[PDB]
Design a protein around this ligand. Structure first.
Ligand SMILES: [Ca+2]
Ligand SMILES: [Ca+2]
Ligand SMILES: [Ca+2]
Ligand SMILES: [Ca+2]
Lengths: 537, 154, 698, 132
């Protein structure tokens, strides 16, 4: 009756809105249809590979008089040394630079190593990298595509951590000192990035209402910044100690802009952005792919900038860590831990977040490797070591969180094959039980059941509630354990090295289980690492 | 050196009125006063001002994250870019905006409860030299805005 | 593209506009030749050029100590460019070129060593050669395109029914939704399917057909001189690497070339040309009373009907930007607003046209006149995405302009722009509504007392604050419990009233009687969207008294009538309830525009439900003072709707029900006086119902 | 043909003027299940809007509706399942889930029965006109 009137009204409604656009389909216009077909063929088909030719063309260019490739390099250099009070487009740079940058299990690895070195010669023997350096000094703060081309070329030169290029570039700085160069470095560092989530809400609300070329939000080409920092890193990998001290000190010019503290508070700003991204995402517990992807991007940024940080201090040239003793790094690390603890819980839930969890734990790993590299110049009671103590002090609660967090899958790795955990419900197939598994783990004199409930977050959640006694378990088994080994190395080095720190005694016993877990796996020696000390390692 | 929670401090202005740098400090009474007022500290040599109605306890000082949590229901350092919970030390009450006018500004005085935006005052250093994201030190300049009325501590 | 190649193209179906030179007229055509040039007998000289060069090469074949101006560079450079210019203007039909190319081919000229600047000339020639070749490569794909979508549209959309008519096609869950998308999106996966119907093999051949003599040697020519002859004049050296890169990426040239092309039918081709001729005419006058010639051409572009039909082309021209920098080149004087007037017209013709103009307010906001700010507001006029797309710090510069307003007139246009900036759809965007108050924390502008002080003591500061009262109520939090069940918009809701009292009756009732046709409504939304029936009477007859009867008194008040037909429809939700009916029925007597009166007619029967229910049946006899006069046709549509009102208020009815039956007998008498008659055929039942359940220029 | 489109028009001529504003379109589509944008909803209109009054007039609506397909017979064909002379009770309650509307057991059992004047326990081919 009335429901029949409802069905016919919705029927004629669906028929009318079907008549609005179903059969309208490229329908009338020959010219417009042809045109749009052209646009699609443009957007699809052109877009292919021919691109094996360029290195060959380089080899053609590397031919005899002056080599014509060298003529071209000379052109771009003289282009750079023109004083145009700003920098411009020059697309042929934007062709040829990345043409060259295109042009870059043991024995074959050495062979291709040498072939790469031959390529790097084949450019930079013609004085290639100096104009890269010139152009980078040349713009000041401007972040044009020109700059991206230069950075791509500079990394493509310095890919293997080639020492030769580092020598050349230092000597270039020596004779023709450019305060404007590091000035330009600071300015290019300066604005350069941050994810700004109000714009994310703008576009996400827009995805509420606009159904649309997005993705421009993510730190306004984060990627370029990653390239810059990787360029800084591959500037000083190989412990170019002179270059590390120069980047601190920059002495030959008038002035000095220590770029170290510059990148310190840069990544501090990055930390701020991601921590407020948590204070946003503290409550909503489900993230779709957009925020996840922006996370992953920023994650790679953090990883890169930590690698730069290590490579400043990795050769333990003291002035880096002396400056960084008075850096504002420490609290940003503290907030990082504050991120990590709360993040790891809600990441450790479902099928989705596990990849991003790997991201966080891996950045977590080499993050602590950074302060391991910081650590290595200690004496008896580390002043710097005490700074590590004090910054550990304020980061207590989250440290309890993460140690419990490691203890979860650690004791998983313990019980995971005992027959009072394996032959408990079945013989064994992987499919075991929920509650017999649950009371197995619980009956091991082991868990407050909160840990089981977190383990019963999902653990299979597929029709049967028997888990996979290996797969979920191997997802937990290794993939959070290296980091615990690292921090174990860390805190043992602190406590062993600097003794008599009462709170540190509390901290160390406070998850002593993982330490004694890792006692089968650490290794220590003692040597004289060229400071003529017994420097244990 | 710096400032964390639960430490004791006053505010003060030095209002240069009639070209006299009048070191007037804040003063709210309570127990029959629902308003703040001023208190001169310049003539300390002959008129010692009272301190008790001028001391104020830093109970808490978080950002927008924690704030939203409290509204949606021992040494934390105090940061440019925080709004804090501030108690009057003596009365125990909680300083806040008051929703009357006596011009079109809003009145200033104590209250009990920590609910609502009124007991929150965001910190901004009034210099480019200082900035948001670091601790407040001994004797810094600062600008406090309400969170209910979002007007200035004027 | 190919006989189973040589750049002697015969067809050349491009456009490349026409060259009809003025005769050297030495009569009164002085500023009427005025278009081209003096002209001359061309093709004598084209004989000479071949006569010259082929001799001159053979004269330079010995490379004697002879040469004419002393050097070869004295010889050749004024020749080749002169030829190359003459090459440009579309002469030398291919058999001319066939000899000419075989000078250049022999396959000699390139086989000679040559000095420095000649190959700086010569490289441009072969550069020019690739372009028409690329055009020839471009024009070739046009022919592939035409039949193929004609093969394709005749394939799928016909069969698209034949899947859906096999399915039904009133159901459309997924299979119709598979081919229900955007037109480009319909073309998107249609083409991209072949990237992973056998007819895609034609495409598959075509890409491989358009993959690929000269491309070999052009590279080989450079690396002669690149090797041997270590070169000065780097711009020459610059120019060579273009071509090499143009050689080894011939493909990327096609990429950029692709969004230049266009296809049309044969009729439209004239309105291209004259427009195209007058197009580059504007591009010509870029290099400079220095505006007057432009202004006539601007409207001709407007006067094209082939101006809306291919709108992305004009966007693909980017010809707006050619206006834009010219206006920037002005801004370093009277004819300025024409281009403005073109521009705000221009972007408005489509959403995507508004899109490309969005980037340029960033400049244009800095450029107040007294208009360009109209154009600045033009590309943000409506579009909801664009409301999200914009940024905040620009708006500070807008209110910096408002910050200096400490007197004035001139702030009044930013607000109108900002009123576009925050509402744009009938829909107040809260992000923009968030940010607008924050500056006003640090920027003020008994000010509201001064409004009636302006009623005596130039009309502007009335209107100037009247924009301010529009935008604030425009930046309401929301329209619902959306505003209520929320967070901290409530905090601005206090700020919405910590700043403003009621107060406004300085304008509310006062300007409702005497500016008056608009600015009363400038108040109305603010009290509506920010601030049950106590305020009815507190504001009753406020304008509604003097409005309702003055219909024959046209004429700004008769202009003002629909300007407040919005107003009484807004509150559509105890003595003076008849006084509202006094204000109601007289306008109903005035309505015994009209569609806006039909909007106000919607305010009639909705009052009948809220209608002390005794005052409704009594005042309906005033309708019965006209209901026998029904059969005023608008009055005949009104009381017939009001006949159901006593059919509504009958439950409280069960003094005037006696003659109402006589009026029902007069309703039978109007039925004794006679579709449109069905307006009473339902109303007689309400006339039966008013008798039934109630019994349960004057 | 003629009135069956005007009934389809006046179903969507909500304001009742012969013209369809773009707000009228998404008003139905947000009661039909969708939630389209006005910058899309205008684009449903403007290609149909060849007369260019801003709205959609019925003679442009009429010829637009003419090339798709009575509406009644397929509407009964959504109702009728196999062709056994009647629509069974579980058959009719399976019709409603294709337009997405849900139901309980009680509501339509009386709606069959308030249409079941003859009393055969089903809805035959006859009762599509007794209820309509
Ligand atoms: Ca309409
Ligand atoms: Ca129409
Ligand atoms: Ca049956
Ligand atoms: Ca039946």
């Amino acid at each position: 009756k009335a429901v029949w009137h409802k069905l016919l009204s919705k029927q004629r409604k669906r028929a009318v809105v079907a008549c609005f656009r179903m059969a309208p389909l490229y329908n009338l216009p020959r010219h417009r249809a042809v045109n749009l077909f052209l646009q699609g063929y443009e957007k699809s088909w052109i877009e292919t590979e021919e691109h094996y030719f360029e290195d060959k063309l380089i080899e053609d260019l590397a031919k005899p008089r002056v080599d014509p490739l060298h003529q071209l390099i000379l052109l771009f250099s003289r282009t750079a040394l023109t004083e145009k009070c700003k920098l411009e487009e020059d697309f042929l740079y934007m062709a040829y630079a990345d043409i060259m940058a295109k042009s870059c299990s043991f024995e074959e690895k050495e062979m291709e190593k040498q072939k790469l070195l031959y390529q790097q010669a084949r450019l930079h023997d013609r004085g290639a990298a100096e104009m890269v350096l010139q152009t980078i000094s040349a713009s000041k703060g401007e972040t044009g595509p020109m700059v991206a081309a230069t950075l791509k070329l500079g990394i493509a030169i310095l890919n293997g951590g080639n020492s030769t290029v580092q020598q050349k570039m230092l000597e270039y700085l020596k004779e023709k000192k450019d305060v404007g160069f590091f000035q330009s470095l600071a300015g290019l560092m300066q604005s350069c990035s941050v994810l700004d989530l109000n714009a994310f809400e703008r576009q996400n609300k827009a995805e509420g209402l606009g159904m649309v070329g997005s993705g421009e939000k993510v730190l306004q080409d984060d990627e370029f910044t990653c390239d810059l920092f990787r360029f800084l890193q591959l500037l000083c990998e190989g412990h170019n100690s002179d270059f590390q001290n120069y980047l601190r000190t920059q002495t030959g010019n008038n002035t000095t802009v220590n770029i170290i503290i510059s990148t310190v508070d840069y990544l501090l700003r990055v930390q701020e952005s991601i921590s407020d991204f948590y204070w946003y995402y503290s409550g909503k517990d489900v993230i779709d792919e957009q925020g996840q992807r922006n996370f992953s991007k920023a994650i790679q940024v953090a990883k890169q900038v930590f690698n730069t940080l290590t490579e400043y201090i990795q050769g333990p040239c003291t002035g880096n860590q002396q400056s960084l003793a008075h850096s504002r790094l420490w609290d940003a690390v503290v907030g990082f831990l504050h991120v990590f603890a709360h993040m790891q819980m809600k990441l450790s839930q479902d099928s989705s977040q596990i990849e991003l969890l790997k991201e966080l734990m891996d950045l977590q790993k080499d993050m602590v490797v950074m302060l391991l590299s910081m650590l290595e110049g200690n004496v008896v009671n580390g002043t710097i070591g005490k700074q590590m103590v004090d910054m550990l002090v304020e980061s207590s609660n989250n440290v309890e969180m993460i140690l419990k967090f490691f203890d979860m899958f650690l004791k998983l790795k313990d019980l995971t094959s005992s027959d009072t955990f394996k032959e408990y419900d079945p013989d064994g197939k992987g499919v075991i039980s929920k509650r017999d598994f649950h009371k197995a783990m619980e009956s091991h004199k082991h868990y407050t059941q909160s840990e089981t409930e977190f383990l019963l977050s999902c653990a299979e959640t597929d029709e049967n509630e028997t888990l996979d006694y290996e797969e979920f378990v191997k997802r937990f088994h290794e993939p959070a354990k290296d980091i615990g080994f690292n921090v174990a190395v860390l805190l043992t080095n602190l406590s062993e090295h600097m003794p008599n720190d009462t709170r540190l005694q509390t901290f160390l016993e406070l998850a002593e289980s993982v330490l004694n877990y890792f006692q089968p796996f650490l290794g220590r020696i003692e040597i004289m690492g060229s400071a003529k000390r017994i420097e244990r390692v | 050196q710096f400032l964390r929670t639960d430490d004791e401090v006053v505010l003060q202005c030095t209002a240069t009125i009639h070209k006299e740098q009048q070191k007037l400090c804040l003063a709210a009474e309570g127990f029959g006063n629902r308003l703040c007022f001023l208190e001169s500290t310049s003539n300390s040599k002959n008129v010692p001002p009272d301190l008790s109605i001028c001391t104020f306890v830093l109970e808490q000082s978080l950002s927008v994250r924690a704030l939203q949590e409290m509204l949606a229901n021992g040494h934390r350092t105090l940061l440019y870019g925080h709004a804090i919970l501030l108690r009057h030390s003596y009365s125990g009450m909680y300083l806040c905006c008051l929703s009357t006018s006596r011009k079109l500004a809003f009145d200033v005085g104590l209250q009990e409860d920590t609910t609502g935006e009124a007991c929150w005052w965001t910190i901004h250093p009034a210099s480019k030299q200082r900035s948001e994201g670091e601790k407040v030190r001994v004797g810094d300049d600062l600008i406090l805005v309400s969170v209910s009325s979002e007007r200035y501590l004027h | 593209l190919f006989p189973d190649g040589l750049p002697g193209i015969g067809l050349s179906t491009s456009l490349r506009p026409r060259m009809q030179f003025s005769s050297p007229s030495f009569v009164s055509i002085n500023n009427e030749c005025y278009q081209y040039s003096p002209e001359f007998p061309l093709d004598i000289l084209k004989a000479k050029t071949i006569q010259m060069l082929t001799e001159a090469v053979q004269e330079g074949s010995l490379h004697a100590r002879d040469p004419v101006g002393g050097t070869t560079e004295f010889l050749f450079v004024p020749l080749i460019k002169l030829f190359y210019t003459l090459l440009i203007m579309g002469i030398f039909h291919n058999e001319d070129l066939k000899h000419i190319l075989q000078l250049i081919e022999p396959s000699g000229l390139l086989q000679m060593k040559l000095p420095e600047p000649v190959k700086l000339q010569m490289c441009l020639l072969l550069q020019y050669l690739c372009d028409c070749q690329v055009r020839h490569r471009i024009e070739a794909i046009v022919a592939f395109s035409d039949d193929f979508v004609a093969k394709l549209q005749d394939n799928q959309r016909f069969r698209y029914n034949e899947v859906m008519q096999a399915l039904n096609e009133c159901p459309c869950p997924e299979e119709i939704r598979d081919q229900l998308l955007d037109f480009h999106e319909d073309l998107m996966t249609h083409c991209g399917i072949e990237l992973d119907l056998t007819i895609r093999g034609r495409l598959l051949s075509l890409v491989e057909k358009v993959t690929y003599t000269l491309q070999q040697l052009i590279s080989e020519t450079m690396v002669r001189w690149a090797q041997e002859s270590v070169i000065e004049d780097p711009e020459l050296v610059r120019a060579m690497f273009v071509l090499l890169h143009r050689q080894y990426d011939g493909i990327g040239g096609l990429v950029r070339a692709l969004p230049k092309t266009y296809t049309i039918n044969g009729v439209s081709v004239e309105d291209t040309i004259n427009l195209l001729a007058s197009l580059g005419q504007i591009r010509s006058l870029l290099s400079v009373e220095e505006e007057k010639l432009m202004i006539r051409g601007l409207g001709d572009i407007m006067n094209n009907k082939v101006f809306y039909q291919h709108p992305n082309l004009m966007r693909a021209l980017g010809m707006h930007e050619t206006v834009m920098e010219v206006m920037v080149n002005v801004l370093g004087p009277k004819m300025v607003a024409n281009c403005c007037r073109f521009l705000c017209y221009f972007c408005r013709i489509s959403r995507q046209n508004q899109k490309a103009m969005f980037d340029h307010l960033s400049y244009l906001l800095e450029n107040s006149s007294v208009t360009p700010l109209d154009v600045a507001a033009a590309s943000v006029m409506d579009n909801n995405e664009l409301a999200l797309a914009l940024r905040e710090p620009d708006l500070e510069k807008v209110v910096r302009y408002l910050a200096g307003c400490g007197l004035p007139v001139e702030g009044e246009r930013y607000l109108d722009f900002l009123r576009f900036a925050v509402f744009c759809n009938g829909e107040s965007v809260e992000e923009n509504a968030n940010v607008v108050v924050r500056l006003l924390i640090r920027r003020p502008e008994g000010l509201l007392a001064a409004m009636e002080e302006a009623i005596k003591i130039g009309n502007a500061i009335m209107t100037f604050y009247a924009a301010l009262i529009d935008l604030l109520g425009r930046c309401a939090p929301e329209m619902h419990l959306i505003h209520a069940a929320k967070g901290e918009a409530i905090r601005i809701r206090s700020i919405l009233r910590s700043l403003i009292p009621l107060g406004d009756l300085v304008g509310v009732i006062s300007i409702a009687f005497q500016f008056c046709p608009d600015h009363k409504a400038a108040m109305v939304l603010f009290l509506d969207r920010v601030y049950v029936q106590d305020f009815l009477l507190h504001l009753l007859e406020v304008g509604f008294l003097p409005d309702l009867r003055a219909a024959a008194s046209l004429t700004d008040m008769a202009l003002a009538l629909n300007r407040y037909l919005c107003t009484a429809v807004l509150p559509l939700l105890l003595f003076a309830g008849t006084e509202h009916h006094a204000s109601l029925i007289d306008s109903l007597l005035h309505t015994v525009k009209g569609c806006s009166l039909t909007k106000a007619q919607r305010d009639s029967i909705e009052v009948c439900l809220l209608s002390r229910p005794s005052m409704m049946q009594h005042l309906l006899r005033r309708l019965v003072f006209d209901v026998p006069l029904l059969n005023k046709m608008p009055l005949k549509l009104l009381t017939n709707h009001y006949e159901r009102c006593w059919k509504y208020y009958c439950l409280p009815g069960g003094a005037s029900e006696e003659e109402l039956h006589l009026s029902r007998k007069l309703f039978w008498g109007i039925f004794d006086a006679l579709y449109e008659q069905e307006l009473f055929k339902l109303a007689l039942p309400c006339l039966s119902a008013v008798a039934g359940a109630l019994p349960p220029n004057f | 043909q003629i009135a069956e489109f005007k009934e389809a028009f006046s179903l969507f001529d909500k304001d009742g003027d012969g013209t369809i504003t773009t707000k009228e379109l998404g008003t139905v589509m947000r009661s039909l299940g969708q939630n389209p944008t006005e910058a899309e909803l205008q684009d449903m209109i403007n290609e149909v809007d060849a007369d260019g009054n801003g709205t959609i007039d019925f003679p442009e609506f009429l010829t637009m509706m003419a090339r798709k397909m009575e509406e009644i017979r397929e509407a009964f064909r959504v109702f009728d399942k196999d062709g056994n002379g009647y629509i069974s009770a579980a058959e009719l309650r399976h019709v409603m889930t294709n337009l997405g509307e849900k139901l309980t057991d009680e509501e339509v059992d009386e709606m069959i029965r308030e249409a079941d004047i003859d009393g055969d326990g089903q809805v035959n081919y006859e009762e599509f006109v007794q209820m309509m």
